[PDB]
Every structure is written in C-alpha cells, then in structure tokens.
Scaffold this active site. Structure first.
Site, PDB file in Angstrom:
ATOM      1  N   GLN A  32      12.375   3.183 -11.814  1.00  0.00           N
ATOM      2  CA  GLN A  32      12.748   3.649 -10.492  1.00  0.00           C
ATOM      3  C   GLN A  32      12.852   2.441  -9.572  1.00  0.00           C
ATOM      4  O   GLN A  32      11.948   1.600  -9.524  1.00  0.00           O
ATOM      5  CB  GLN A  32      11.722   4.649  -9.969  1.00  0.00           C
ATOM      6  CG  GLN A  32      11.938   5.106  -8.550  1.00  0.00           C
ATOM      7  CD  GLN A  32      10.749   5.892  -8.027  1.00  0.00           C
ATOM      8  OE1 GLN A  32       9.707   5.319  -7.713  1.00  0.00           O
ATOM      9  NE2 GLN A  32      10.898   7.210  -7.931  1.00  0.00           N
ATOM     10  N   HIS A  53      13.550   1.313  -5.627  1.00  0.00           N
ATOM     11  CA  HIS A  53      13.645   1.695  -4.226  1.00  0.00           C
ATOM     12  C   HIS A  53      14.381   0.629  -3.406  1.00  0.00           C
ATOM     13  O   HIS A  53      13.883  -0.485  -3.237  1.00  0.00           O
ATOM     14  CB  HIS A  53      12.245   1.961  -3.661  1.00  0.00           C
ATOM     15  CG  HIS A  53      12.232   2.302  -2.204  1.00  0.00           C
ATOM     16  ND1 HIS A  53      11.204   1.929  -1.366  1.00  0.00           N
ATOM     17  CD2 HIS A  53      13.127   2.965  -1.433  1.00  0.00           C
ATOM     18  CE1 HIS A  53      11.463   2.353  -0.142  1.00  0.00           C
ATOM     19  NE2 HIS A  53      12.623   2.983  -0.155  1.00  0.00           N
ATOM     20  N   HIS A  56      13.041  -2.883  -2.356  1.00  0.00           N
ATOM     21  CA  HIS A  56      11.754  -2.730  -1.662  1.00  0.00           C
ATOM     22  C   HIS A  56      10.587  -2.701  -2.639  1.00  0.00           C
ATOM     23  O   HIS A  56       9.641  -3.479  -2.505  1.00  0.00           O
ATOM     24  CB  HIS A  56      11.730  -1.473  -0.788  1.00  0.00           C
ATOM     25  CG  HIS A  56      10.523  -1.380   0.096  1.00  0.00           C
ATOM     26  ND1 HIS A  56       9.298  -0.935  -0.357  1.00  0.00           N
ATOM     27  CD2 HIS A  56      10.350  -1.696   1.402  1.00  0.00           C
ATOM     28  CE1 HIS A  56       8.424  -0.973   0.633  1.00  0.00           C
ATOM     29  NE2 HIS A  56       9.037  -1.431   1.711  1.00  0.00           N
ATOM     30  N   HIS A  57      10.648  -1.776  -3.596  1.00  0.00           N
ATOM     31  CA  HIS A  57       9.710  -1.745  -4.715  1.00  0.00           C
ATOM     32  C   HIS A  57      10.399  -1.225  -5.976  1.00  0.00           C
ATOM     33  O   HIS A  57      11.488  -0.648  -5.907  1.00  0.00           O
ATOM     34  CB  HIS A  57       8.450  -0.918  -4.387  1.00  0.00           C
ATOM     35  CG  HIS A  57       8.619   0.560  -4.569  1.00  0.00           C
ATOM     36  ND1 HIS A  57       8.708   1.436  -3.506  1.00  0.00           N
ATOM     37  CD2 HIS A  57       8.712   1.318  -5.689  1.00  0.00           C
ATOM     38  CE1 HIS A  57       8.850   2.668  -3.964  1.00  0.00           C
ATOM     39  NE2 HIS A  57       8.862   2.623  -5.284  1.00  0.00           N
ATOM     40  N   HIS A 113       1.858   9.644   1.331  1.00  0.00           N
ATOM     41  CA  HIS A 113       3.063   9.578   2.159  1.00  0.00           C
ATOM     42  C   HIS A 113       2.716   9.104   3.591  1.00  0.00           C
ATOM     43  O   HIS A 113       1.773   8.323   3.750  1.00  0.00           O
ATOM     44  CB  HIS A 113       3.867  10.877   2.076  1.00  0.00           C
ATOM     45  CG  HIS A 113       4.269  11.243   0.682  1.00  0.00           C
ATOM     46  ND1 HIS A 113       4.686  12.510   0.335  1.00  0.00           N
ATOM     47  CD2 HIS A 113       4.303  10.513  -0.459  1.00  0.00           C
ATOM     48  CE1 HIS A 113       4.961  12.546  -0.959  1.00  0.00           C
ATOM     49  NE2 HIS A 113       4.736  11.347  -1.464  1.00  0.00           N
ATOM     50  N   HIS A 150      -1.451   5.800  -3.639  1.00  0.00           N
ATOM     51  CA  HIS A 150      -0.233   6.417  -3.182  1.00  0.00           C
ATOM     52  C   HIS A 150      -0.490   7.618  -2.273  1.00  0.00           C
ATOM     53  O   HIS A 150      -1.316   8.494  -2.560  1.00  0.00           O
ATOM     54  CB  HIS A 150       0.657   6.811  -4.366  1.00  0.00           C
ATOM     55  CG  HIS A 150       1.939   7.462  -3.956  1.00  0.00           C
ATOM     56  ND1 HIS A 150       2.988   6.756  -3.404  1.00  0.00           N
ATOM     57  CD2 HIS A 150       2.336   8.753  -4.007  1.00  0.00           C
ATOM     58  CE1 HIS A 150       3.978   7.588  -3.130  1.00  0.00           C
ATOM     59  NE2 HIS A 150       3.606   8.807  -3.488  1.00  0.00           N
ATOM     60  N   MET A 168       0.647  13.363  -0.704  1.00  0.00           N
ATOM     61  CA  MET A 168       0.002  13.123  -1.974  1.00  0.00           C
ATOM     62  C   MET A 168      -1.249  12.310  -1.739  1.00  0.00           C
ATOM     63  O   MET A 168      -1.369  11.610  -0.738  1.00  0.00           O
ATOM     64  CB  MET A 168       0.942  12.392  -2.924  1.00  0.00           C
ATOM     65  CG  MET A 168       1.810  13.333  -3.729  1.00  0.00           C
ATOM     66  SD  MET A 168       3.093  12.442  -4.577  1.00  0.00           S
ATOM     67  CE  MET A 168       3.834  13.754  -5.556  1.00  0.00           C
TER      68      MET A 168
HETATM   69  O1  LIG Z   1       6.618   9.914  -3.092  1.00  0.00           O
HETATM   70  N1  LIG Z   1       7.221  11.226  -3.275  1.00  0.00           N
HETATM   71  O2  LIG Z   1       6.341  12.061  -4.084  1.00  0.00           O
HETATM   72 CU   LIG Z   2       9.307   0.716  -1.713  1.00  0.00          CU
HETATM   73 CU   LIG Z   3       4.490  10.683  -3.532  1.00  0.00          CU
END
Ligand SMILES: O=N[O-]
Ligand SMILES: [Cu+2]
Ligand SMILES: [Cu+2]
Ligand SMILES: O=N[O-]
Ligand code: NI
Length: 309
Positions: A125, A127, A62-63, A199, A197, A269
């Site tokens: 990371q 996803h 996804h990312h 949520h 960013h 966030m």
């Molecule tokens: O995107 N979880 O901090």
């Molecule tokens: Cu993603």
């Molecule tokens: Cu976050």
C-alpha cells in the site's frame, strides 16, 4: 525507476533473491490517494523475509505499508485501498514513513512466508501526499524491495496486534479511553519494535507488559506523528502469564456525531502493532488481542498513558 525487461526478481545467490514490489506506473488524481497492489510469492515452498529496502520517490510518497496474506482484496494491476487490503487477515510486515527512520530486522530474524501455512501474497500500500509533484503526468513505480531466503532463520519475526472493537466516542466528550488486555499464553516473545495506529481523534497510544502488577513500557506514541515502526528502548520479553495492556486516548471534540471503530476515515481505530521475535521452534507468526480481560487492572496504569507529547 520502473524495471521493464529485467522484471521483479533478482537472484542474490543459490538460495536467496530480491523481490521488487512496485507500483505499476500510476498517476493519482486527488490528494491523499491510497493505492494497493499484490504480488504472489514466486516460490511455493517456505521462505523467510530477512530485509526490506524502501524505493520511494522522496517527494510524492507519504508512507508505505507491506502486508502478507492469502486473499488480496482484489484482482487487477492495482486498486484503491478503500476496496480493502486483504479479505483474510493482513499481516503487516513493514512500514516506511517519511520523517521516521525505518529500523532493520536484527540479523538471524525473519518473517516466515510461503509453505503450507505462510502468506502466499504480498500486499503493498502506497500513500501519496500531494500531486504538486506529478504536474507532468509521471507514471510512478515506487515500492519496496524485499530480501527472501530459503535458509531457515534461527529467530522468527511476528506480530502481536492489539485492537479495540467496541470503542464508542461520544461527540464533544473530552476523554475516551479504549483499553485492551489479554493474558499471554505462548512461549516467550521479545518485542523489538512497535507501531501505533489511530485516525484523527487519537491523542496517545501506549502498550505495556504487566508482570505481578508491574507495568513495563513497550511503546508510547502520538498517533498523529508518522506511523512507522519505532524500536523499543529496551527489548522487552513477554512470557506465559504476563498480561499485555494497551490504551488509546481519544477526544470527540469537533465531532457532530459519535465515532466508533471501523474502516473509513470518519471512523476510528485503536491499534498497537507489537513486532516481536521468537525462537524458531517455539514461534508463531501472529497473535491478536481484541478483548479487555482485566478492566479493573487499568486503575494502576502509569500517568504517562494519559498525557500527550
Ligand atoms: O486507516 N483506515 O482504517
Ligand atoms: Cu502516510
Ligand atoms: Cu485505520
Ligand atoms: O527473556 N528475558 O531476558
Ligand atoms: Ni530476554
């Protein structure tokens, strides 16, 4: 494709090399899995990251995020990024999103890594969306190929991070603004990309330069769209004296209890990552604003900041 006998380092010439940062052949078990793994830099001396090439399975991923830090959250081949990314500050270097064109570093611009002060680790990371793709028990080696050079670059890339810390979103409350403001007190930076960013409750994110009370837009985006680094329309200079201001718009509708800033998916966030460059001899690699030093200033914020796509 997994590397095997050749390993992760490709010499490009006398002083450059490609570093392949890949998942160690992983097989997720649930949807929306977040995997992380770190790699130490092969060089101790200072080096510059001048390019990034995405190596992702177009179906599974996804990312992808890439960070630099000095203390990855854990030892071990890989881990769930719920354990964390880094114990120290994770400096985001790179974001790859599915339906979003990653944009290149301008030539002559690089992130400073290694040395006495630079990052000693990369943290990747990845996803993963659905496992309708690994219905055959595939091990995955997706990641990022990073271009490193020991040639000092004329311009150094960096991150100016705006984030809320004190936001509280009451349940069902229609609109909550998170405002962030610091004064810029360094040598000039030039913004060339941004990522936002948030949520699930974020409606819109906006960042401005304010100079003699004049709001100059840096980036404005729907945080429910893929969270890549989008380029700035017109490269914006921020200079000693300016004020950076950011606003996240939130709703608490569909929420039984209040939502605050924090790590989990049920927290929120408000993060705006402003990617910039500076002249090497003036440059620093990261700045953060977590305060709101001009709350009264936000009365003249353009209307755009309050309305979504
Ligand atoms: O995107 N979880 O901090
Ligand atoms: Cu993603
Ligand atoms: Cu976050
Ligand atoms: O840095 N002003 O073009
Ligand atoms: Ni300029």
């Amino acid at each position: 494709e997994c590397l095997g006998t050749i390993g992760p380092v490709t010499p490009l010439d006398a002083s450059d090399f490609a570093l392949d940062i890949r998942m160690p052949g992983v097989t997720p078990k649930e949807s929306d899995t977040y995997f992380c793994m770190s790699m130490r830099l092969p060089v101790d001396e200072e080096a510059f990251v001048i390019d990034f090439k995405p190596r992702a399975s177009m179906d599974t991923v996804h990312h992808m995020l890439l960070f630099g830090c000095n203390m990855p959250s854990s030892t071990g081949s890989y881990w769930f990024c719920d354990e964390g990314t880094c114990t120290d500050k994770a400096n985001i270097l790179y974001a790859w999103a599915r339906n979003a064109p990653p944009t290149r570093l301008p030539k002559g611009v690089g992130f400073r890594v290694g040395g006495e002060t630079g990052s000693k680790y990369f943290v990747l990371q990845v996803h993963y969306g659905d496992i309708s793709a690994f219905r055959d028990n595939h091990k995955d080696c997706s990641g990022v190929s990073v271009h490193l050079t020991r040639v000092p670059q004329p311009l150094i890339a960096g991150m100016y991070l705006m984030m809320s810390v004190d936001t509280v979103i009451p349940p069902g409350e229609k609109v909550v603004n998170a405002d962030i403001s610091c004064q810029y007190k360094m040598y000039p930076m030039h913004v060339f990309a941004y990522r936002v960013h948030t949520h699930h409750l974020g409606k819109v994110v906006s960042g401005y330069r304010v100079r003699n009370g004049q709001w100059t837009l840096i980036g404005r985006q729907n945080p429910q769209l893929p969270q890549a680094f989008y380029p700035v329309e017109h490269p914006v200079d921020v200079t000693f004296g300016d004020i950076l201001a950011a606003r996240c718009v939130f709703t608490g509708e569909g929420r039984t209890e209040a939502t605050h800033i924090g790590g989990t998916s049920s927290d929120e966030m408000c993060n705006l990552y402003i990617m910039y460059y500076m002249e090497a001899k003036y440059a620093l690699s990261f700045m953060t604003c977590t305060k709101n030093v001009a709350p009264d200033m936000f009365r003249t914020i353009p209307a755009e900041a309050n309305i979504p796509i």
